[PDB]
Amino acid sequence: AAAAAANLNAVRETMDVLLEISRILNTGLDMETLSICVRLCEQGINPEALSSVIKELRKATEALK
Amino acid sequence: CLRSVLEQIAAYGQVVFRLQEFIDEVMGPFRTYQAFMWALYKYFISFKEELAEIEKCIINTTITLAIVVDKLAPRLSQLK
Amino acid sequence: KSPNVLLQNLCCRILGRSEADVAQQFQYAVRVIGSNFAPTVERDEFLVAEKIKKELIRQRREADAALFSELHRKLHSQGVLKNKWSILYLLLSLSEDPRSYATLFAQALPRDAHST
Amino acid sequence: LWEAALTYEASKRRCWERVGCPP
Amino acid sequence: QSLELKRKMLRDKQNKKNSGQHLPIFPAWVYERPALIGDFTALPIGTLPLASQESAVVEDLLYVLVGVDGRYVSAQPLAGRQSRTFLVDPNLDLSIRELVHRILPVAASYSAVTRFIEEKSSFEYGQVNHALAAAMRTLVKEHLILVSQLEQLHRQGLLSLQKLWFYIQPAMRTMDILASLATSVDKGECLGGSTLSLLHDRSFSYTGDSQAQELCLYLTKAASAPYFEVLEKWIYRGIIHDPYSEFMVEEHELRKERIQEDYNDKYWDQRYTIVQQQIPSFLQKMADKIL
Amino acid sequence: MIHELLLALSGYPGSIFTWNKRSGLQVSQDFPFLHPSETSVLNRLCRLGTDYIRFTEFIEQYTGGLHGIYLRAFCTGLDSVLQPYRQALLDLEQEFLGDPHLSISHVNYFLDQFQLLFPSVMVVVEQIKSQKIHGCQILETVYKHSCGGLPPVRSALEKILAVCHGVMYKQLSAWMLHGLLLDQHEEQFSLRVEILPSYIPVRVAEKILFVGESVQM
Amino acid sequence: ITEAALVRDILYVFQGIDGKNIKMNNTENCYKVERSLRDTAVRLSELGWLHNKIRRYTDQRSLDRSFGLVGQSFCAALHQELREYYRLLSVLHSQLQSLTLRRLLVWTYDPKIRLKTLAALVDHCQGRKGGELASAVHAYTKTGDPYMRSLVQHILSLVSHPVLSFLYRWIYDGELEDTYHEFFVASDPTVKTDRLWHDKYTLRKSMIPSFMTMDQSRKVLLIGKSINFLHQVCHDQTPTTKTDLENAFQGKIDAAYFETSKYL
């Protein structure tokens, strides 16, 4: 398939758009993890729950520093 | 616009055609003709390598007309 | 995949330690994902786009707000994401400022004059 | 799945007769 | 009335300002055009089906909230004082019309607000009115944000008149507060510390919901910002520059009467004196020590 | 379309724009796939490319004709100043390959900085043609417009200027060290106003003449 | 009829280009169409008519060199601002194919104040150059509008850059070579040798800005006159011995003053 891979290039293009959005906002997230988050909202999820998850997980790496 | 840009390339192509005709009439004495065409031939040896490298980049595109003509500006000036 | 197996890879990206070394924060993740799963306000990416503009004026930059506008247009032009509101609200929630009033601020529809 | 397949070599050949996003 | 009022204040702050020449004014057209404020078909809606009438009237009020008149609704042209009236067509169904009457006052308490922002943005009213109208300016922008949301929600085939009547009440409180404040500062020709005592009192007055307390507290700080700089200047350093005459301390020379001597104690006399009504009424208890 | 347009701007007139020796690249032809007002936009853009053409012909004819190494130095800086006008035609098509959504206004937008350089250097180029100066007093009429007031045409003329002084240190190296003259035709051997720029002190020039003369003996 | 035809025309009247059904019909009035949908068009077309006013002036005064280097720096600042304006307009074009924000009424809101301000500024600075123009642009910084005072100080930072380069040509070298009178010294063109101190340099009062006092100009005049008298009479030439305007004036001019007077 050829059109099914140009859509994957399209996914990477929006992923770089969200890369610029992540740096101007100063988030710690990288590209692989945001693709995991994209799949999470494919199944449907509260962003308020994902932010509480990540707002526990990042400042539970500051408790073993 | 096409008719003009290929015309400019044609005006340069006359100057290469005249020289190649002059070279062909030596291998197809004055005692300086051979010593002069030797340096001319060496010039073509360098110049052709530069041009074939551009063609090597064509086999491997993003190159348009406006890239190679600006690249070859200091050579087509030297041709005149 | 499925959400229960998806959270453990988050625990390996954000934390550097394995999911067999720590489970307590994985347990908090399970606890908050289980109990409530659906939003309490309505969605639209237009409103959070106008709120991302409000955040970018707030950090005393003004050029990147015109950057975000062409970027948010590209988000529409491609159209591969199923819910575009959630990830933009999500990046909005994790904002950081390097460097009054908050009871006026533009909010969502309350859903108190709304029944599904 | 996405990130596994993303890593491929993209279009560097550009069309002048198919200017808008050449495959 | 206003065109007179501006020049009438401009001349006093002209003759006071003895270090600054030709104080700035704005060009005439910034007052001439009514296309700088938000407020400036002919068919009977009465015989129509109901769910078309509803979409029609929602579209018209949603235009009226931002000044511009809708389709079956007009701004009755008054264009003197902060009072403004609107007229909906009398061929409307009555019950819907009465709900429309409940939504209407927010428009008059829009028109007064933008008119205030245009009249009090000039140099004849001083830097306090500049900051006050400039920080009041942002809530109008936010009001446009809120009605843009309702534009979406009406486009989506789900907005009813009762829902929007529920939605506009928190903004109705805000526009009511700012229309009352704008009327009160308009009538008394208040500027300087006279409109800084008033916001001290207005910050005191509403404290039972705190929806409006954040508003007046930040508006107090925004209007007090140049005044604190001029004060701090007088506090740390005998130099002042006093760009417009709205400060508690006024300096008129008593050196030209008692020259090269302090044999009069002229400083404690009528050289550096007080203005009574230009103190913001909470620096009154430190007033002698400041001077 | 814009592959055509971004080479029409490079200099080729075409049959959409008509070259003229009064003002080049004139469009009056109507197209229903273009807006009728678009022509006005196009007209503004045309004023740039015309000057870019008018300069290059000027470089072709030179190096009563005008001759000199100064004509090999003015035209030389004229090459380097036109180079970011070439780069910004490449970058535009680079952006157009990815986003074809962008309209003519982005082109007009992106090249707004060259509606400051081109007229203020165009008047200098016209001064050098209408007057027939080719000598050493060309450094004066270039030096007075160096002060500028519009920054990007303010620095561009600086680019040329140093070159001229580098060229004037070729004459003042043959003269001052070897006592050698007429390796360039002139603009014992006296001091004249044409061979000396009128903002260099005359006493220093007398020292220059003495040092150049003493070598030959 | 469709609203997109209006949206197309009003998208053009921002740039100063008339649309197809919306054109400028009176010079003193704004764009006229040639109920609600009609009344919104005058609202947005105000900004492009204001744009015509400032674009024509920054066209004209840039090619005027008898207006001075200061004034051409004004035109550079105006050109930079109009560049940012067209940069907004590019995004506003490509956002269709459709995105309306109260039909772009939210978008136009803060550029409106930015056009209002400079349309006032081009008319208050009419027929001025140098420190006269500097006082006229310092006039607009007595404002409590934070957006406007920031917008103004950027322009003040821009215009005061040539005048400081003339200032340090009069601190360290003591020479003025101006033929455009934008400096606070009126020089006498006839040469003076013993009257040199008294007569060649006079204070021009109309090129002093409102961030400088009399003592400041007079101390700098004395310094430049002093180190020029050091060369033209004494012949002992030296290799350049060394909140006001962020108060870099009063350090430099004092240290300079001390230096020149002691050595003379």
Residue to mutate among B1, B4, B71, with most F CBs inside 10 A, is: B1
Number of Cβ atoms within 10 Å of the Cβ of G195: 11
Q: Are strands E85-88 and G185-187 parallel, antiparallel or unpaired?
A: unpaired
DSSP per residue over C58-108, as a string?
HTT--HHHHHHHHHHHHHHHH---S-HHHHHHHHHHT-------SSSS---
CA E85 to chain centre: 19
All residues at 6 or more sequence positions from E64 whose CB lies less than 8 Å from its CB, including other chains:
E70, E73, E75, E86, E104, E107
Three-class HEC string of chain D: CHHHHCCCCCCCCCCCCCCCCCC
Q: Do G43 and E130 lie within an 8 Å CB cutoff?
A: no
d(CA G120, CA F72): 48
D16 touches chain F (CB under 8 A): yes
Q: Do F100 and D19 lie within an 8 Å CB cutoff?
A: yes
Retrieve residue G203's tokens.
């204070």
CB E275 within 8 A of CB E250: yes
Q: Which chains touch C (3 or more CB pairs under 8 A)?
A: A, E, G
Retrieve residue G164's tokens.
């400081």
d(CA F67, CA E241): 63
Question: Mutual orientation of helices G214-232 and G249-263 as an angle, nearest 10°?
Answer: 40
Chains A and B are in contact, defined as 3 or more C-beta pairs closer than 8 angstroms:
no
Retrieve residue F162's tokens.
């140093």
- Please provide residue F26's backbone torsions phi and psi, each rounded to the nearest 5 degrees: -100, 125
Determine the distance in angstroms separating the CA of G119 from the nearest CA of chain E, rounded to an integer.
Answer: 9
- Please provide residue A52's backbone torsions phi and psi, each rounded to the nearest 5 degrees: -70, -35
Residue to mutate among G22, G62, G67, with most F CBs inside 10 A, is: G62
d(CA E156, CA C42): 13
All residues at 6 or more sequence positions from F138 whose CB lies less than 8 Å from its CB, including other chains:
F70, F74, F128, F164
**What is the C-alpha R_g of chain G?**
25
Task: Residue D16: name the closest of F92, F15, B61, A6 by CA.
Answer: B61
d(CA F201, CA F191): 12
Distances (CA, A) of C68 to A19, D21, G98: 11, 22, 17
Retrieve residue G134's tokens.
């500097």
Q: Do A48 and C98 lie within an 8 Å CB cutoff?
A: no
Put simply, the chain C residues between 18 and 77 with a CB less than 8 A from any chain A CB are 22, 25, 28-29, 32-33, 36-39, 55-56, 61, 64, 67-68, 71, 74-75
Question: Mutual orientation of helices F38-61 and F71-81 as an angle, nearest 10°?
Answer: 150
Resolution in A: 7.6
Q: Do A51 and C11 lie within an 8 Å CB cutoff?
A: no
Q: Which chains touch F (3 or more CB pairs under 8 A)?
A: B, D, G
Task: Residue F160: name the closest of F90, F55, F87, F64 by CA.
Answer: F55
Retrieve residue F150's tokens.
């519009």
Enclosing H/E stretch for E249: strand E249-251
Q: Are strands E272-274 and E249-251 parallel, antiparallel or unpaired?
A: antiparallel
Q: Kindly identify which residue of chain C lies nearest to residue E166, measuring between CA atoms.
A: C113
Task: Residue G62: name the closest of F112, F107, F138 by CA.
Answer: F112
DSSP per residue over B56-75, as a string?
HHHH-----HHHHHHHSHHH
Unique residue bearing structure tokens 């007052």: E31
G56 touches chain F (CB under 8 A): no
Task: Residue C28: name the closest of E46, B41, A54 by CA.
Answer: A54
D12 touches chain B (CB under 8 A): yes
d(CA F48, CA F115): 7
Enclosing H/E stretch for E273: strand E272-274
Closest by Cβ to B64, choosing from D12, D13, D16: D16
CB G9 within 8 A of CB G48: no
Experimental method: cryo-EM
CA F71 to chain centre: 11
Residues of A in contact with C7 (CB under 8 A): 53
Provide the H-helix boundaries in F30-70.
Answer: 38-61
Long-range contacts of E42-51 (CB under 8 A, 24+ apart): E43/E72, E44/E89, E44/E91, E45/E72, E45/E89, E45/E91, E45/E92, E46/E91, E46/E92, E46/E93, E50/E93
Enclosing H/E stretch for E212: none
D20 touches chain F (CB under 8 A): yes
Task: Residue E75: name the closest of E34, E43, E45 by CA.
Answer: E34
